[PDB]
């Protein structure tokens, strides 16, 4: 099945030129637990935001241009994408907006992270109708010494 | 001798709260990469905040009152706190405000961060006196993909 994963600012905001203000160890954490194991799939953006591979998961990049590592698999097109992650039960999308746009149509379910933070970015979320997802999973965190903002976990699956 | 090592927002703030909202991983590698190997002294609320004792380095913490984990060293006093860490050519001071501000007037250096990010607080650094101070080291960086705010590395010596 196809999953995206996203953590989102208020008004779906996903990104901006830097990254984005917020210090969410606990965020991290959820996002390594759920891709534990699983392929992931990016655009180029964000690849270049992370930097390196994600160990244990096979990586792949979405580029109209050819591979700039040999550490990470690069494909042309969506199918490509899929393909390239052959058989597995679950397929990761991390991002970022382009991508999104993409796979949401195609995606089974998602694993969001509300963020209680209001920031100006250039990057949203796509839109997900109410009414074709069921929340199947929440569960929220105040601010603490360890995490900027508060957050809340959602599990959503396609109704 | 003793130093301390800590990032400051502007007007020295460093504490708040909640975790201050920011995303400074090439901060928190210049944190890592001074401190290493070294005994690292904190007080009680930050002990709270980082929720773990440092790897790699001797953990010391401050507090009236008796710990509550046998991982770290607990110590009643200054004098306690410096002791515990034994014959050493440096000592780290990590934190926080009151902690800082007992320790100055015994350091030898200073390991700052600079960082571009107007924040509200309710912790600072205490106040230097630049004419007590010599800058030896300086290094700015701009905000990117990784880094929310752009920040400075600075060390200064005592006059
Ligand atoms: O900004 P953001 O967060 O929206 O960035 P993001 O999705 O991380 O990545 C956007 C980039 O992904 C690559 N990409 C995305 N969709 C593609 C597709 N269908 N076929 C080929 N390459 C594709 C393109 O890279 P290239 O610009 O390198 O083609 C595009 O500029
Ligand atoms: N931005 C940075 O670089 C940086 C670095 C460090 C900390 N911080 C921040 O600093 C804040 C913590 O600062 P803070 O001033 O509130 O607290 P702090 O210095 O972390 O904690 C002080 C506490 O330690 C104990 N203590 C201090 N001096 C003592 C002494 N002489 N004898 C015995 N116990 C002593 C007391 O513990 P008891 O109450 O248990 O007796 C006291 O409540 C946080 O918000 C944190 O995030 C920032
Ligand atoms: N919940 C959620 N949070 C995010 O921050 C997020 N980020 C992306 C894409 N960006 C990133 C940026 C950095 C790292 C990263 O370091 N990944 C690590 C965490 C490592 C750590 O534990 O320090 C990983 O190991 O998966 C991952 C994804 C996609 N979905 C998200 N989903
Ligand atoms: N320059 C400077 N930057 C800071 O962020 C800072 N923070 C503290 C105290 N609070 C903390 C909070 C977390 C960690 C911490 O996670 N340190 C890890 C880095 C692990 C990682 O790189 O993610 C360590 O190994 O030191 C340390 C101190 C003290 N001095 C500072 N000094």
Redesign the pocket.
């Known amino acids: 099945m196809i999953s995206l994963?996203?953590?989102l600012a208020v008004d779906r905001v996903i990104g901006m030129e830097n990254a984005?203000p917020w210090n969410?160890?606990a965020?991290?954490?959820?996002?390594?637990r759920n891709?534990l194991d699983k392929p992931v799939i990016?655009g180029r953006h964000?690849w270049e935001?992370?930097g390196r591979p994600?160990?244990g998961?096979k990586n792949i990049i979405l580029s109209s241009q050819p591979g700039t590592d040999d550490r990470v698999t690069w494909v042309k097109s969506v199918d490509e994408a899929i393909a390239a992650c052959g058989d597995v039960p679950e397929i990761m999308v991390?991002?970022?907006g382009r991508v999104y746009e993409q796979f949401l149509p195609k995606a089974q379910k998602l694993?969001?992270?509300h963020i209680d933070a209001e920031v100006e970015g250039d990057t949203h979320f796509p839109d997900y109708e109410p009414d074709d997802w069921e929340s199947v999973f929440s569960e929220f965190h105040d601010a603490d010494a360890q995490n900027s903002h508060s957050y809340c976990?959602e599990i959503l699956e396609r109704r």
Request: net charge positive.
């Open positions: 994963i996203a953590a984005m969410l160890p965020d991290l954490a959820w996002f390594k891709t990016m964000t935001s992370i994600l160990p998961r991390i991002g970022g694993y969001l992270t976990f």
